[PDB]
């Protein structure tokens, strides 16, 4: 799956 | 170069 | 925001 990061604190992985 | 994430769990970042 | 890296070595990461 494809991996994107958000930043929100904390960094959140989440996926595709 | 830009990177790529992908996790299959092993994650992999690919250079563009 | 999301967050884009790249490898410059470094990586970077910057906040869109």
């Given at each position: 799956?494809?991996?994107?990061a958000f930043a929100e604190a904390?960094?959140?992985g989440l996926m595709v």
């Open positions: 799956a494809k991996l994107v904390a960094i959140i």
